[PDB]
């Protein structure tokens, strides 16, 4: 028992030595007399110590506590906290006025003493505001918007002609606005509006976390466009008439570009934007202290040098959002805010990094203007240096498949007058097509809340440009239809690996599938509410039966895909249906080898597959993703060679070069009517050698991730307190609940998916024979492609023809 | 153009009329004289207005605001800011001295005084220690412990003796302690230490998001406990003898209620603990204001009433901590803090709901007492209520499962002395074996970030009760063994449905299998550092082989489970081996269909677990497990009907019936000798209908949530704001790599399983028979029913034959 009574005794020892440690009992019900508290309070001499030290510190105010005060008080303005709220604002100008004293840069200074006349300003009309002198509703702090000289300034340039205040000083403005419907009424204005200048087109350039290379070659490639609109020929039947003419086209140009967070843009992205004049951080840092601004905008005339060359001077609006947030809200911004404002009369809409040709704007004017029927146009788009890097199989392959989708299937779509774009995609629309209803259907999403509409509303709206598409196709009252210009090359950069194409395509397959889902059923629309030519509608009618037919065939690709390999290769070995070789005798234990070594490893690839999409992202997994793709691509490398064989070792019997030629060789024949077959030679091969890769690791890897998307008393106090609780548990609450619902919905359809692909192959390979079941697939395909080159051929027929018969 | 110069000159219209919108260009280099400054400034006099109101607002303070003043004070000096510091704890201790008049609550009134002087006092200390004249290391405010008056008191009440202090008065105070170990360094003590009492047991009951009930049965429960040990005996063979004895055993036990969150404690229990006078929200309010304490902790000798009986008095110590954690954090505080102080003989680890039968207490002492080499112990544990809703199956299991691994693998481990202790179970320890590396081993999760980890040590730790039970065994220099007590029953309370059970036994089996693989990696230490006898060490590698061999027969039991079903009963009813009818001839067509129908089920219900068991969450899935369970459940009793007709049909051979008995009727045999047989009669079938069920269902689930585991200028603002970047960017960086690497490691593991189980099926289907794979089977599953058996017998032998053989 001696340790216990030691470690005792040493705990008692070290008890002695606001002390270290104080126990005291608190009697309830006394209440205390008012005598010996005051005594006691005045006998403490340490507190007038503790005050003059308090006093001396908190002479000297710094930058830091006025901006951390101005942020305290932009919290409870929020908050609707006025009195609070005008008292901090008071401090915060008080304090920010005696610093602009000591501060040594003149422009630190000037911004400072600026912001605190500002912010008293401001004391003054919320004090106001406060008496009732003024009534007002919802009471926010002036527009105020401040011009500064670039910090660097090119002086050897060439123009036309430029204002000084316009070449040298870039102007800034936070807005507060949280509708953007309302962003004229709040009485913000830009630079074009305020000059009198009234620009017709306008281009957006969404951007997040991007090199500067991509920015610099986007601003290039425009500046070459708008080079060649201005030196465009007058006088001339080709050439375009009005506000596009020459010496004059760069004022009716505005260039808007989003940037969708502050806290995730590239930092080499930002120094390059302050070095055109387009960006200083100590300017959003002061001027944006008390606001707090939902984004803010920076508007300068940018000059740009290449080399020995000086490019046009490009309009530039550039909006940074201060909180992250999805695509689709920076097309909100652009759209309603500056559409609504400038009222332009055509829209463009572009990515960050593509690079246009120099005639890609001259095409899409000149088909809208010479049309008029246009409501929407899109480009052609490309892979930037396909032949060089050819070694590469992925970039091969996504330029074959670029090529094959925009010669096909635009021009077969674009034939009817109804296209759907290709996400990333370089299109345009005309701003009176687009000006109601349609918006209200591309942005139901960001009005309404995810857990109103469900997972079905939001998987259609993650690809939502075909939903805008289709309603201006479909306007109620108005016909208008689109159109696909084959001269408009824009150029992107394609990932080099298999890993980002895996996540790019996925995006792709889940907004494109869910968006045809969704113009299946709404297409009665057509002719319910809109108002087209019978012919239009037949045409329609006609196209919505091819599109139910590839639906429906799509869909069924990969049990078609095993069907068809299996049957045609493997039992051809096992059977003696090889028509170059006899397999008929054998050991026996070869021919149903090669059977079972197919089978299983088919069904275990697809078994790691699903097993390795379901759970970890496709970034660690490189290597198992490249073992799979590697099989799959010899297997359909070694199916290719033996279907060869077999083909030409056929004595080529009519139906059989019939079939031939519509299945395989309408790729040929639509490449060399459109001039574009040098590609299809060189790439066709490795197309070939990732058609299974794509087929099954992009669908199931896409399946697999529907659900990924985006002055009171104590007792005020205790009260405040449990409503925050009970906020915050119906928050978890809510989020859990929508969470249910989503993984719900894609278990749900990924299970069904995958059981009717097995449920077909299985009743297709236990009761039909080689015999019986080849036959439909030839005839289902060749009616496909025939379908497709007859579109093909007569979107060429129409490009070379319209221009003669324009008269009639 | 006529609307578009309307709408232009509607905008300049709205244009006119801190305005709403000024625009002006600051010059920047100019920086202004100072004479026209001054004047401007003074030509204002708005300024006076809102000077003076203000001035008017500010006069009277508020307890809300006083309370954010503390707050914001906490955080400062948090982030070592002591003027800022000092000057916000000035200004709240001012606030609530003058709030304290207002108050007519008198219990407010003295709680808020006294909180303001202590302030002050702080503030005093504070202050010279800025000035240089006290040196101390990390200051802190000094501890201060409030007792208060119990709201509700039992005037009729019956107790041995109770000072009036310890019967009225609840303590109460808040601790800072980061580290728990300098716990008792920091001053901070506990009533039993100041009052002189020295407990020898220490229980702990830790608590989060708990109903009322469990807690009230529980301390019920332990009340009876205590009353059993007082009225024991004296002067007999049976009876304990020492600080346990009768009249003063009260006073020797002290209870530890660690709470896990406020967040999350069900309010009714807070209403409840307040009712026995454990807890007080304006006492917590109140006090807790300046500190920034991790957790709160109360002190009460609190006495209970139960109908007509009024149990003994129980000290309790409830620590409520703030912020949510894992239960091995409130293990650390309780461990750490608590023994480390009051360093007691026994430490007792249960659950909060477990209701312990009147006699659990006096066996587990009476063992540590006669035995002197148990370093720990472990309880029965069993099902509340088991005979009641016999209909319900899911209890049903639950129950033979119990009774089946307590009898079985208990008494079999515990014979060797050596037990892996069953997750929720009641245990205890001797405060003497868990001293220093057994406990460092315990909590280097919590010393050490999982990113140092990695995954496996997660996952083992998940579980992390048998890494103690190792390390007290095979602890350096000491030889520790471990025992099992047949009559300390504890019963808990199972969930009712399937979902519950999947969660909860996915806990467990992550647990249990990564703590197996620890410690067969790890066994080797016993002989190389532990200090045991010859024959204990022999006897270690005797278990050591058989719990290899059985760990592997369990890994591939899914398999042997498919193979034994499939080749039993359906290549009995395709090949004719039924013994009770003659499937000889038949149509031919049902031959083979029974098979083909057997293999598909089980194939797509696999593919179905597994595709839900890797996604959602199996909550919304209930009906889907649901009827896979029914599915399974079906196909089990069908072939337990089959193959006992087929057993009943055989002639009875001799090797028949020792295989049978070896195989199943051990755990009858076991059952009966025991005397617990009545509740394997009845649980039977009922367990039988769900092995299938819990083998797959659980297996699965478990396997596929591997990785789910818990006065600067304007310069120095810019380079605040950048570091701030860099660091959130880095900690989400961070974030990101480990979710991959965990990530990973689940897939890995899960595929091993998974395509091991799988080839193993297929090469014993295609390369093996019936007749050459059946009697190996038979032989494992004899071997290890037959050890068990023997375990379970030489327990008992020890359980009724030490008593007599103690001399010896
Ligand atoms: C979905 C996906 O994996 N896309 C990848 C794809 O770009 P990918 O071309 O597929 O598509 P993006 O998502 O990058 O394009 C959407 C457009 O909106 C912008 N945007 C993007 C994200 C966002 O939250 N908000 C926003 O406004 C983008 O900058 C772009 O202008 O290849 C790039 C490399 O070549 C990768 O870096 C991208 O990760
Ligand atoms: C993992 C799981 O699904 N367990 C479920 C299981 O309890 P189950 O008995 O399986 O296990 P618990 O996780 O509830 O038990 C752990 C012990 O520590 C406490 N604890 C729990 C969580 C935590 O974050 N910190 C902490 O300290 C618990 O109160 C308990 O005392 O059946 C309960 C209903 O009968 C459910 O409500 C639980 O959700
Ligand atoms: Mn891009
Ligand atoms: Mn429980």
Redesign the interface.
Known sequence: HA??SS??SV?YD??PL???????????????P?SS?QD??SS?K??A???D??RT??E?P???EA?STLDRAAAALNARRY?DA??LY?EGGYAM?NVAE??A???????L??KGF?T??????L??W?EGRIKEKHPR?????????VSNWDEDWVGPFMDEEEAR?MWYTPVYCPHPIDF?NL?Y?LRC??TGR?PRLMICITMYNEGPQQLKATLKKLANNLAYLKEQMPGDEKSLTGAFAGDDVWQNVLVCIVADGR?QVHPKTLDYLEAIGLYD??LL?INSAGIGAQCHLFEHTLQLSVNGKCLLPIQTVFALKENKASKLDSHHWYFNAFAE?I?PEYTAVMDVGTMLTKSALYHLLFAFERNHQIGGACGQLTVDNPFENLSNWVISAQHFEYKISNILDKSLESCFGFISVLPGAFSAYRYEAIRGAPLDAYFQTLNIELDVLGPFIGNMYLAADRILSFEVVARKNCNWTMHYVKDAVARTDVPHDLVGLISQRKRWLNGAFFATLFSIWNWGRIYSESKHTFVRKMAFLVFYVYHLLYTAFGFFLPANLYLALFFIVFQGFQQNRLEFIDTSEYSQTVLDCAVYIYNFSYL?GLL?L???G????P???KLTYYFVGAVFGLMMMLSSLVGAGIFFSTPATVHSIVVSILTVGVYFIASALHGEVHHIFMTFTHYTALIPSFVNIFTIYSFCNLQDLS????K???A?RRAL?EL?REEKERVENR??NF??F??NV??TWA?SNLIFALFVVYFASSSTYMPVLYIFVASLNTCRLLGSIGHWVYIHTEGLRGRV
């Open positions: 340790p216990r470690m005792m705990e070290g008890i606001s002390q270290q440690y104080v126990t005291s009992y608190i009697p309830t019900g006394a209440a205390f008012p508290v006691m309070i403490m340490s507190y110590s503790a005050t030290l308090v510190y908190s000297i710094s930058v830091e901006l009195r005008l008292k008071l006025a000591r501060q840069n003149p422009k630190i200074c000037n911004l003493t600026s500002e008293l300003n401001w004391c003054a009309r004090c106001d406060i702090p002036g527009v105020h918007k401040v011009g500064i000289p000083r004229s009485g204005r509006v305020e009234r806290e951080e100590d840092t404002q009222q275990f790691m699903i097993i390795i379901l759970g970890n992202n970034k660690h997994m002055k009171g008393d104590f005020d106090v205790i405040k609780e915050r969470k249910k993984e719900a894609r278990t990924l299970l059981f």
